[PDB]
């Protein structure tokens, strides 16, 4: 298996109309299986175990930034195939790589090998 992308990022919880970040910082990485299916997984840094694992089909979801709450790097994953969306925050000190990771995520979820 190969990891298309991987960067330190924590997940969040959006309920009703309020977004609350999770202190359980993890790692957002993408891996393509021999089935040519891109796997979107989120591993918690607390235990280093993969807490999330779901295959993302082409154009299934969109990875974008949410410039609504100024304070840090916040991104949101929206599933075009459905109406469910997730929120994440980068843990990288510098965004010099956050932007690339963001682009790569969209490339692996919208432009798989």
């Amino acid at each position: 298996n190969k990891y298309l992308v991987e960067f330190r990022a924590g997940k969040m919880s959006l309920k009703g109309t309020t977004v609350t970040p999770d202190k359980r910082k993890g790692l957002v990485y993408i891996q393509q299986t021999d089935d040519s299916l891109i796997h979107f997984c989120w591993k918690d840094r607390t235990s280093g175990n993969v807490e999330d694992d779901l295959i993302i089909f082409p154009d299934d979801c969109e990875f974008k930034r949410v410039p609504q709450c100024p304070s840090g790097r916040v991104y949101v994953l929206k599933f075009k195939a459905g109406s469910k969306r997730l929120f994440f925050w980068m843990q990288e000190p510098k965004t010099d790589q956050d932007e690339e990771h963001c682009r790569k995520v969209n490339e692996y979820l919208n432009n798989p090998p």
């Binding site: 924590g10 109309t17 309020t18 977004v19 609504q68 980068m90 843990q91 000190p93």
Partner: peptide, 14 residues
């Protein structure tokens, strides 16, 4: 060293 986590905020599809 590492950046601190963000604080809770309201999100509205404007």
């Amino acid at each position: 060293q590492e950046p601190e986590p963000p604080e809770p905020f309201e999100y509205i599809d404007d």
